[PDB]
Design a protein around this ligand. Sequence first.
Ligand SMILES: COc1cccc(N(C)C(=S)Oc2ccc3c(c2)CCCC3)n1
Length: 275
Amino acid sequence: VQGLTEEQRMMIRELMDAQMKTFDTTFSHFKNFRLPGVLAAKWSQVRKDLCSLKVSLQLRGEDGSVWNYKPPADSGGKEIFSLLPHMADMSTYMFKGIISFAKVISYFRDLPIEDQISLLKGAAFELCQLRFNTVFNAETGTWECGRLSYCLEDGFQQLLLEPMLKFHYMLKKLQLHEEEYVLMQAISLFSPDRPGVLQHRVVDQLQEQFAITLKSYIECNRPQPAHRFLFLKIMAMLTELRSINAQHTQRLLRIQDIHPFATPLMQELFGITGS
Ligand SMILES: COc1cccc(N(C)C(=S)Oc2ccc3c(c2)CCCC3)n1
């Protein structure tokens, strides 16, 4: 790109290299996942917690066959948990790609292992949502995950009330480059204020370099009036994503409390000990 320092161009490359190596955009290796079965104040809030992300699910076979699953309606029972096992498998698959992404980046390997763990615990969800946005189809409200499709159930303005859905639509509208998505991932990963981080100074210095690189990238490759304040818009979305992360963590722990579903990797990322 233009106007970047050699160190910034190298920084952008290694992020792009790590994204290329660890983001299976066709989801070809997402396999052996569970699928929905065939044929007191907690519950009110878990009932409200689960209805926030209502999606149907399509599976296109290599032979051309199509399986499609329409979820039930909430009717006061355990049917609200039908996609929990499948969604756990997908998020687990994505978390593994995220962990692989961090471990390739030199700036991440060079951190102490305890801080590596702390940063991944704090940012794994956010980097997952950033990767899902690149396969989000805002015209059809569908995350195109290769042979899997997650379609939002029916208007458009009433769904933007859901913060994570609003995030995906608003982030998609910015029409970001691959380089800007991966820089967002690095900024979110290297957040110095996550619980348990010890090397706050180096992590803060690294994050600042990633933000400066992103600011510089935008200024060198986006002169259009539509991209005025784009960097600031991106940074605001990252703050919103952190809020959504905290929201979603409390959501998940409440559902986990009355209906266990978290995989071992999810338990590790969310602090669940097993006792
Ligand atoms: C109760 O909270 C839960 C339950 C189970 C899994 C999760 N996680 C951690 C994640 S990343 O779920 C998502 C979030 C967004 C999306 C998908 C999964 C799949 C495709 C559509 C976009 N969260």
